[PDB]
Amino acid sequence: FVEMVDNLRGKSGQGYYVEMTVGSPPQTLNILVDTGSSNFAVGAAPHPFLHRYYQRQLSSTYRDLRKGVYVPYTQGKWEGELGTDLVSIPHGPNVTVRANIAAITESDKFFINGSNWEGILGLAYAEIARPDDSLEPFFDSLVKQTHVPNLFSLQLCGAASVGGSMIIGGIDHSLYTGSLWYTPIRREWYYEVIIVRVEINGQDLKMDCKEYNYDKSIVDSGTTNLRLPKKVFEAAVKSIKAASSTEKFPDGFWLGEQLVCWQAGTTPWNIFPVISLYLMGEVTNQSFRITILPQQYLRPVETSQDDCYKFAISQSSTGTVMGAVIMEGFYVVFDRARKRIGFAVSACHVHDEFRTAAVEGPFVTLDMEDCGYN
Numbered sequence: 001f002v003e004m005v006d007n008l009r010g011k012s013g014q015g016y017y018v019e020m021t022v023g024s025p026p027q028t029l030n031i032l033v034d035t036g037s038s039n040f041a042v043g044a045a046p047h048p049f050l051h052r053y054y055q056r057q058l059s060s061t062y063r064d065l066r067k068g069v070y071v072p073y074t075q076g077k078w079e080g081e082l083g084t085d086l087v088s089i090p091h092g093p094n095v096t097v098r099a100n101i102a103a104i105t106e107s108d109k110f111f112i113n114g115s116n117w118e119g120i121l122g123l124a125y126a127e128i129a130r131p132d133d134s135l136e137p138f139f140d141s142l143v144k145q146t147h148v149p150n151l152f153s154l155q156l157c158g159a160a161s162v163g164g165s166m167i168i169g170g171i172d173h174s175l176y177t178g179s180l181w182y183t184p185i186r187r188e189w190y191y192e193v194i195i196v197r198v199e200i201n202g203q204d205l206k207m208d209c210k211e212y213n214y215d216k217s218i219v220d221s222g223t224t225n226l227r228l229p230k231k232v233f234e235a236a237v238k239s240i241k242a243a244s245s246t247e248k249f250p251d252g253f254w255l256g257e258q259l260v261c262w263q264a265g266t267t268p269w270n271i272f273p274v275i276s277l278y279l280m281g282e283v284t285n286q287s288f289r290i291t292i293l294p295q296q297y298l299r300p301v302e303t304s305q306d307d308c309y310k311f312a313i314s315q316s317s318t319g320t321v322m323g324a325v326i327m328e329g330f331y332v333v334f335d336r337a338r339k340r341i342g343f344a345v346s347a348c349h350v351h352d353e354f355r356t357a358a359v360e361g362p363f364v365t366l367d368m369e370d371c372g373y374n
């Protein structure tokens, strides 16, 4: 689908956006791609951080729906006015749909100063769409009204600016190597999945696997880090710290709280451990794993003029989150038509000489559904 190849742009830590058009004639907006939420919301007022915004007065195709919406994310908040209008995606499929659109009229800590997107495309399921599930997420409208197959895939790169591909309706083998392995979407709300084993440098964390998914493990392009649940994080960092005892760092650093720096020619990569998450496979008692490097969890922050990095694993309280730390390692297929998410080694994932991100199977794991949570 070389039409859609390379249709995602971004800057480090400001997410990935796609161009879309809204209303007739078409207003062009840069919309953040987010599998972590389910609302298509766009700036409709001249906030000073925005390059552009939706002007509903300019579109003959606009239809108020005389309802207001609040949408609070973990990080952020916006208030809006619900309507509908016609939505195309220049470098996606060649269609045009009547999608719901929240017109953002008030926001706090939502938009990012210096960024180049003006909206957010929530690609997850109605069950978390605000204000309630009657509000039909864009992708559901897209499928319900076109013949575009019920799936999309994401190749998030990031070599300053990043890039990538959102293939809508399909998959493109030029974007990955090896085979796609698939883990079932456990519930259609977020893209929730189950992690059944966690390894650092090949060494199990001998932990009840129910912790790994407490109370959720989810796939979120709208998030930067790998977010391990509090106790698994406490324990994850414990072995990460211990495998990388070679060198010393402040304890705050691991809690996020301050960069750490090195030489512009060699950093100690071969000195932090690869991380492996085993994920529920498609078959009774079969799992597989995805393995990331530190060229994923140690990401640059652009006093400094040396090849430097931040620690990108952090704690949470609404689950595990496989943000871009994970996603940038892999080509990820959101197979909604089959209640399942596929991972394959990404063609662009940034590695080194020795190691590499991998996707491997099958493995034998008993009692995978007990790793879940109710």
Ligand SMILES: CCCN(CCC)C(=O)c1cccc(C(=O)N[C@@H](Cc2ccccc2)[C@H](O)CNCc2cccc(OC)c2)c1
Pocket: 013, 014, 015, 032, 034, 036, 037, 038, 071, 072, 073, 074, 075, 076, 110, 111, 128, 129, 130, 220, 221, 222, 223, 224, 225
């Ligand atoms: C995305 C680029 C960098 N950012 C945003 C800057 C703060 C992050 O790395 C980040 C960090 C923490 C949390 C979030 C976040 O809340 N992401 C949501 C999408 C988003 C919002 C604002 C700006 C950019 C991206 C994402 O939807 C969270 N998924 C969980 C969730 C919680 C509550 C309600 C939900 O759906 C209604 C979803 C993003």
